[PDB]
Design a protein that fits this description.
The chain contains 4 helices and 11 strands. The chain has about 240 residues and is α+β, with helices and mostly antiparallel strands. The termini are far apart. Interacts with host MHC class II molecules composed of alpha/HLA-DRA and beta/HLA-DRB1 chains.
């Protein structure tokens, strides 16, 4: 339930990070893991579930270990047939069975059950996103999802992908924007947001950032609102 909005001296600034926005960019530009009717094959630590997800493209991996906020959240989805969608990283990765390498891909949350989570028909109310560049609302685009209770992560990954392409949200040196956050407003008024900018330093740690999503936070496509609030780098 309910999160305030970003306090001024609280948001991450790109002029403070110094290690290629390209490493932050790699996670959202045409990037994610997708699985349709998978059940957990096994676990590494109490809180994650390992799936036999093969890189259904240019095979980079065949197993994907996604971490949840704890053992209880894992316990809930283990034995379940789930749809998955999340952004993966290769930087760090689990040391399973010690018997059977090529590609181990990691992620956080991104697990939605297949059972009755799809629409009677197609991509429903393809989720609209409001963009504010320096207060001002300038764009609004929609993102499609075929599930009723979709992860906030999935929408976040599709929102950013769009922005990166037409707004150049993230680029290889740094970013056109100093600050940025994606605000999610649930139909009940519940509100929450994610900082879109990397922490101050040279390196960006992919896994530490992506941990935002381990909570496995879901919403509802039909009713949810989203506003991305940016702030351009001055000059």
């Amino acid at each position: 339930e309910s999160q305030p909005d970003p306090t001024p001296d609280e948001l991450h600034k790109s002029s403070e990070f110094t290690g290629t926005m390209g490493n932050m960019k790699y996670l959202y530009d045409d990037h994610y893991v997708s699985a349709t009717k998978v059940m957990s094959v096994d676990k590494f630590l109490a809180h994650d579930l390992i799936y036999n997800i093969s890189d259904k493209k240019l095979k980079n991996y065949d197993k994907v270990k996604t971490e949840l906020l704890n053992e209880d959240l894992a316990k809930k989805y283990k034995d379940e047939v789930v749809d998955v969608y999340g952004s993966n990283y290769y930087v760090n990765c689990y040391f399973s069975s010690k018997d059977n390498t090529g590609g181990k891909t990691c992620m956080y949350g991104g697990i939605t059950k297949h059972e009755g989570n799809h629409f009677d028909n197609g991509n429903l109310q393809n989720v609209l996103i409001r963009v504010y560049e320096n207060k001002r609302n300038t764009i609004s685009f929609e993102v499609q999802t075929d599930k009723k209770s979709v992860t906030a992560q999935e929408l976040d990954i599709k929102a950013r992908n769009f922005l990166i392409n037409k707004k150049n949200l993230y680029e290889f040196n740094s970013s056109p924007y100093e600050t940025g956050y994606i605000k999610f407003i649930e139909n009940n008024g519940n509100t929450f947001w994610y900082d879109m900018m990397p922490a101050p330093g040279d390196k960006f740690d992919q896994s530490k950032y992506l941990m935002m999503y381990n909570d496995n936070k879901t919403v509802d496509s039909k009713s949810v609102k989203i506003e991305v609030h940016l702030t351009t780098k001055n000059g």
